[PDB]
């Protein structure tokens, strides 16, 4: 929720840099799946399309 620039946050922290370098600790491949179907294509998982938003309130703003 933002509306006004207000405070700003300065070289923001390697967050996203570490996040890359934690998902290169693993690999699709490593886990020994190349994938090789395309061909084919079975069903998999499929949730409901259930929600729930409840943005009106005290920080209601835009």
Request: charged share 40%.
């Given at each position: 929720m933002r509306d006004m620039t207000e405070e700003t946050r300065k070289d923001l922290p390697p967050e996203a840099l570490r996040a890359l370098a934690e998902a290169e600790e693993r690999r699709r491949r490593a886990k020994?799946?190349?994938?090789?179907?395309?061909?084919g294509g079975r069903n998999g998982p499929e949730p409901v399309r259930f929600g729930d938003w409840e943005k009106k309130g005290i920080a209601i703003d835009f």
């Open positions: 020994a799946l190349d994938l090789p179907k395309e061909i």
